[PDB]
Ligand binder design. Sequence first.
Ligand code: A1J
Length: 355
Amino acid sequence: KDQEIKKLVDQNFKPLLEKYDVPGMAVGVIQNNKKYEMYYGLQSVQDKKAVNSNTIFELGSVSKLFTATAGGYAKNKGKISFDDTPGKYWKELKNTPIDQVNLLQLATYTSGNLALQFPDEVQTDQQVLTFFKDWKPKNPIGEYRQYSNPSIGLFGKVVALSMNKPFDQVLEKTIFPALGLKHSYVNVPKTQMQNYAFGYNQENQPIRVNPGPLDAPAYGVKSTLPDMLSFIHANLNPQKYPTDIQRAINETHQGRYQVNTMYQALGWEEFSYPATLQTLLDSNSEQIVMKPNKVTAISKEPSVKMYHKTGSTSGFGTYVVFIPKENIGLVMLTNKRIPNEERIKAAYVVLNAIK
Ligand SMILES: *[B@]([O])([C][N]S(=O)(=O)[C]C1=[C][C]=[C]C(C([O])=O)=[C]1)OP([O])([O])=O
């Protein structure tokens, strides 16, 4: 039976490489604590370098899952409360209007006035501070979800302040070692640069993510297939992990509010399992991703849950999904974007087929 996992991944993911002219793909499955790693194509077209277990990919918004995990960790060591406001940590925001939004509402995109991106002219530390000092509310605080890099980025910044370390070191020195990750990075060091894939844009030009304001907590982590499978393993089966990282992980699985069939957890999107294909696809509709939506309190608390997250950068696509009760999960990393719907569908067919 285990002999079917390679065939399934080949049937469902491998055709996407021709369809979308993607140079390189890594797809991992974890089932009953056994890891399966499927590698396709090249990490670098010009170098003819193969995708392998050392290949580093940009995770885009899947980085937010690390940020959420860092926040869960800081809460459980008593360094923050989710009821706190940012001005408790970043003193220059104390008594400004953004100091009425609490850390949870920042982590989960419900400030009521933060868009997907900062303005293009906002780049320096000084410009980021000014942006948040000048912030005024629009929608009632907590009522509307608008998916936002600045929102979760400020959450990450405040988590880092709570831990007295810059955010890059919170991940690289604390969170990643506690998860057993060996090649996961905010800043890919000199000695691993030969392992960092080129991304490829929609004109098939090689590209990597550009530096930008609070980029690390929003979309700035890079990792390998083995490490992302270890992360999914920690999400499915955290018992072997340190108690504090257990607590952190479990904090990320708690649904905070709902937008119909999508439950917003910390970083992760949560769903009742089994989820219809349309539930999973529509979680990343234009309506949910690009526009304000008024949230509700959770009414139906799912008994059996599954969780997912997409991520994209100019040159990379990522998708991660897991289902605790089936003890299965999947990770897809590409060095060209393909539509979210294809990532979600292929993972749906595969995970369903393996039971
Ligand atoms: B995330 O992957 C956020 N998407 S993103 O495109 O905002 C990431 C990004 C932001 C600024 C610059 C770049 C760059 O230079 O590549 C990338 O979210 P999804 O998958 O929508 O949830």
